[PDB]
Structure formats: C-alpha cells, structure tokens
Symmetry: C2
C-alpha cells in the first residue's frame, strides 16, 4: 500500500500542465476526456513516486477563501538546499507568489512555499 | 524531483492518525508540536513514496461545502482488484461512507471512493 497520486481541480488545465512541466520537471501523459461530463485531465509524473492528476470540468467552479479543513498542500523535494534556493528565485523572477521564503522549519525541513498559477500551496523542499 | 508528501488540515488529529494506520497500513512518526501557534502534526509513511502529513491548529477551523477548485483527493493503491474490494467492504462494515463503489473507471483505474472520518475523498485504487 502507497499513495499513487494526488489530484487537483483546475480551471485552466493547459496553463497548469505547462507550469508543473516547466518548473518541476513533470512529464504529462495524454489528455483524457469525457465529453459527456465536461471533464478533462492529465497525469503528471515526476522522477518516481506519486503522480499529480490535474483535472477540470465545466461544473467544478467554486474557489475556497483561506486556510481550511481538508487537503492543504503538496511538497515537491528538489534534493538539496541549493536546489530550493535556485528554484524559488526562478519562480520569483517569473512573477509567481513566494508565500514563504526558503528556511529551516521547526519540524526540520528546508523549504520555501510558492503558489501555483491558481493559488494552490506548494512547499518546495530539499 | 518528486512529491515528498501531501498535507491535510484536520480537526481531530488522533482520530485521523488511527484511521490511516488501521485501514491503509500507515506508520506514524512522533507528534510534532508548536505550542505557540497551536499547531500539531504527524507524518504517516506507507510502503514507500509520498507521505501523508496530518496536521491541526486551533485557528484552522473552516469546512468547505462541495467540490471546488484546489486540492481534490489522494489515491492509495492496494496492488490488486481483490484488495480494493476487500478494503472497501471492511470500511463499509465499519460504517464509513462509500462515495463510489468499486469499478473500472473510464480513465483505466479499478477503484472505489471512500470518505475519511472528516469527509475527505480517498480513491482506493488497485
């Protein structure tokens, strides 16, 4: 038993795909489509481990206000401290929101926290 | 680069820990605590791959109404079709909500969908 994937409801599917592909080295599979339900999805694969399922459908439309009970974030590890700093700066210069500057957290992670094109939290870990 | 963990805001931390430990074979680490911010957390490890970070803090209190933009669910694989059926039934008999009966989905997964003690979606995959 293990986590096969984590899924994300998205409003602009292609914009999101090319974000994770550009910045986190993800590989996309073929677009899946269910015209009847207005549903579209991609599975993004990383080096190994869990995949990210990005999906959208015409009825999934509501935005959540702040920090609430439920799924909180995902953490992508980069392997080193230097890697977190380098990626956080590439994202900054490309205009993304840096919610958390790189640092050692009290629970022992060297990470930064950035927001994807639709505001979702991602911890960029070593 | 890869997904190190997926995090979940929780209202009853211990209840949630023993759920994932009981049903999905997860192993918990030591409770982390930041008394100043009212924060508590556990990291649950599976066979390998991404971990599940279950956390709570006195200010994270709001519930989200339906299916919205943002993190959608996580999928735990069990390895076989038979395993999905067996686990979905154990969960049913123990009173958990079966949102989706086991079946082959159009995107090629044999899975069921159950709700954890706090209503979060989990796809139980083969």
């Amino acid at each position: 038993m293990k986590i096969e994937h984590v899924a994300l409801w998205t409003t602009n599917l292609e914009q999101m795909k090319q974000f994770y592909v550009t910045y986190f080295g993800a590989t996309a599979n073929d677009l899946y489509e269910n015209k009847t339900k207005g549903f579209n999805s991609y599975f993004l694969s990383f080096e190994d481990g869990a995949r990210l399922e990005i999906m959208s459908r015409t009825d999934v439309t509501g935005k959540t206000t702040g920090e609430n009970l439920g799924w909180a974030h995902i953490a992508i590890s980069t392997g080193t401290k230097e890697a977190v700093d380098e990626l956080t700066e590439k994202l900054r210069q490309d205009g993304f929101a840096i919610a958390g500057e790189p640092r050692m957290t009290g629970d022992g992670y060297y990470e930064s926290v950035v927001l994807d094109p639709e505001g979702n939290r991602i911890e960029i870990t070593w």
